[PDB]
Structure formats: structure tokens, C-alpha cells
């Protein structure tokens, strides 16, 4: 059996930007009668741990990304449009 080394687990789990699948509607919760397809988008977002219950990983640099998303009124048609989201370029551990 191939056990992952301590330092490897340790560096890999530490606070940093990681590809994260983000629910669109949670970002933009405003027209409750419409659904999006896909309902979630792939965004670089801070994740991982700080190994101190008093610190949290949080973005310190951000940037826009713009994607094509279908909007759907459920028995009507689906239409193409565009939406823009924030990615996290940089993360760090900061007091809670």
C-alpha cells in the first residue's frame, strides 16, 4: 500500500486557490423563477486549511471571469446569455 507522505499532505492541503464548483444561483439569487444551465460554474476559489482554529483562508486578490450560460423558464425555452463571476487569484490565512 502506497501511503501519502506527511509533507505532501501538508503542502497540498494548505490555504490556496483551487478549482471549485460554485452554484450560480447562490452568487446571483434574484430571479427565483429562472434556472441556469449549468446550475454551477468552475471557479478558482480559496480552499484548504490554515491549521489554526483562529485563521481562515480568504481571497486577497480577485479577478472577473465571464461565461456563456443558458437561462431556462421551466416549460418554456432555454436561451443563451452571459454571466460574470469572481475568481480568487491569491489566498491567505487571516484572523477570523
Amino acid at each position: 500500500h502506497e501511503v501519502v507522505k506527511f509533507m505532501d499532505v501538508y503542502q497540498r492541503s494548505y490555504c490556496h486557490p483551487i478549482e471549485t464548483l460554485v452554484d450560480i444561483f447562490q452568487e446571483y439569487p434574484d430571479e427565483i423563477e429562472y434556472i441556469f444551465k449549468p446550475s454551477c460554474v468552475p471557479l478558482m476559489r480559496c480552499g484548504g486549511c490554515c491549521n489554526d482554529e483562529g485563521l481562515e483562508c480568504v481571497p486577497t486578490e480577485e479577478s472577473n471571469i465571464t461565461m456563456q450560460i443558458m437561462r431556462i423558464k421551466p416549460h418554456q425555452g432555454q436561451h443563451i446569455g452571459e454571466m460574470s463571476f469572481l475568481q480568487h487569484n491569491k489566498c491567505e490565512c487571516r484572523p477570523k
Binding site: E31, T60, E61, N64, T66, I80, G81, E82, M83, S84
Partner: protein, 123 residues
């Protein structure tokens, strides 16, 4: 046809200030996030500040919190960025940008940005 008209850049000494403005036409800014990004020598684009003029919700880069302040006058369809207590690292090209809030129908342009204003912080 959208235009973003940018003004307010220039050269200052540390601790100094500038006020950027971005006067939009061809759309209503209340329909958008409007704000600034910046690109410094050998760095990627970074969001500096943004405002949703429909309710005045704002967001800021961590590095400018407490120094910069974004606002909007919807009757002039214009946004402003007050930049206080400037440092050397703020040296960049600052671009006005917007994108339509939420979902924007179809294939037309949903996100755009300006020519840029230069901001230098020296001495």
C-alpha cells in the same frame, strides 16, 4: 454603442491622492457592476473596487481597504474612485469596467472595459 469615458490619472508622491471617474453612455449603470481593475508591471489583472449602483453594494481589493472609496452618481451615469494614501505598489494602469448584473441575454457584449488611466506613485 457603449462608451466609457475615463479621467483622473497622473503622477503622485506616496501619501498623495487621485480621483478617477468613468462616465458611461449607451447603457444604464444601475443595470451593472461598474468598477476598476488594475494591471501592474508583470502582474495579472486584479479587481480594485466595484459598485452595484442599484443599491450601493461595494467590494474592494484587500490591499486598498481603508484607502480607496468607490461611489456612483446615477443621474450622471458616472462612477468615481477616490484613491487616498497612495503607495508605490499602487502603480498600475487602472481600467474602468462593467458587466450586466446577473444574466445578460444573448450574444451581445455583457462585460467591457476602457482604454485605461495611468497611475504612478514615485519619490
Amino acid at each position: 454603442e457603449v462608451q466609457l469615458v475615463e479621467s483622473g490619472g497622473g503622477l503622485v508622491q506616496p501619501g498623495g491622492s487621485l480621483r478617477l471617474s468613468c462616465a458611461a453612455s449607451g447603457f444604464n449603470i444601475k443595470d451593472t457592476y461598474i468598477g476598476w481593475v488594475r494591471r501592474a508591471p508583470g502582474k495579472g489583472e486584479e479587481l480594485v473596487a466595484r459598485i452595484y449602483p442599484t443599491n450601493g453594494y461595494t467590494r474592494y481589493a484587500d490591499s486598498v481597504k481603508g484607502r480607496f472609496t468607490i461611489s456612483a452618481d446615477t443621474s450622471k451615469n458616472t462612477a468615481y474612485l477616490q484613491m487616498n494614501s497612495l503607495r508605490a505598489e499602487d502603480t498600475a494602469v487602472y481600467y474602468c469596467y462593467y458587466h450586466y448584473y446577473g444574466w445578460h441575454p444573448g450574444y451581445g457584449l455583457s462585460y467591457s472595459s476602457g482604454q485605461g488611466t495611468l497611475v504612478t506613485v514615485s519619490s
